[PDB]
Amino acid sequence: VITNNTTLPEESELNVQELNLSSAALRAGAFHLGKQCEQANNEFMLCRQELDDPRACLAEGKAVTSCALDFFRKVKKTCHEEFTQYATCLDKSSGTMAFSHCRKTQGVFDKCIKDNFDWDRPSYGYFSRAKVIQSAREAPKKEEKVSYPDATPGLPEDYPKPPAKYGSRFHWLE
Template sequence: MGITHEVELPTEEQLTVQEINLSGPALKAGAFHLGKACEWENNEFILCRDELKDARCCLDEGKAVTSCALNFFRKIKKTCADEFMQYVHCLDKSSPDQQFTPCRNTQAVFDKCVKDNLGLDRPPYDYFARVHVHETERPRPEKEGPVLYPDATPGLPKDAPRPAAKYGSRYLWMW
């Protein structure tokens, strides 16, 4: 997207939110439960961004996603901190590319803690690939129709003479 003087960029105050200061293994350890817990906020942001074709118009929805993630990890810290950290350390230390396979036991302990304390089941692996209908209260944006341009040349009049084709038929299928 090219930037011109007419493009309004958000101010620093509009973009400033509290960041989620977690490492990659910690985000990976909580990713399944986080995706399920913040599913509505994520879908709302993606719907807004895709419908309006401009993420600048969806700053409030983006802030809601970040706020939901912060609240989720605060709840995890309050209720399942030890199980979460064991799972994070296992993901971080057990394989060079943070495979889930060596950490199934610590994952099961963490999943049980989240289910008991937060009431969240770990979604199945194909859950986020399934089709889900998202109900929103945002009004649907008006669709813009295709741009219609007038014909560049009006064409020949109906009574204009048509000379015979120089090299045979004017149509390829008529020989």
């Protein structure tokens, strides 16, 4: 638990411009965000799942946030009204933001992206498979077996068993 010995990062290191978009603006345009920003998301989630340290790969988290900000600024430069209409139809379509309720504006958004950036929208389940990456960060350590030099010693299988000296050593026996 957090004491004075633990080295938390300073608040000036944590002062990063954040992706402050709503749920409809994150659900819409996600399939073009993931393909454009697959190099940093996989490395950051590998950092989060392998080390399980919140203080580690903070630069990777900053890279993910900056890459998402760069993609949304690129969308803001060219295709703004189409993305706004797509997010509006996605939020007003149903309770949960489901893509199947209106496909009419999704085609216009993909047409705008195909005409401007020449990007192809991926399939429906491209981002839910297993991702294989060539991470530059080395894996930390193999789980070594704990050494117990003084355990409870049993009788070994190779130990010879001569007959007992004067047998059972009971009363009147042997």
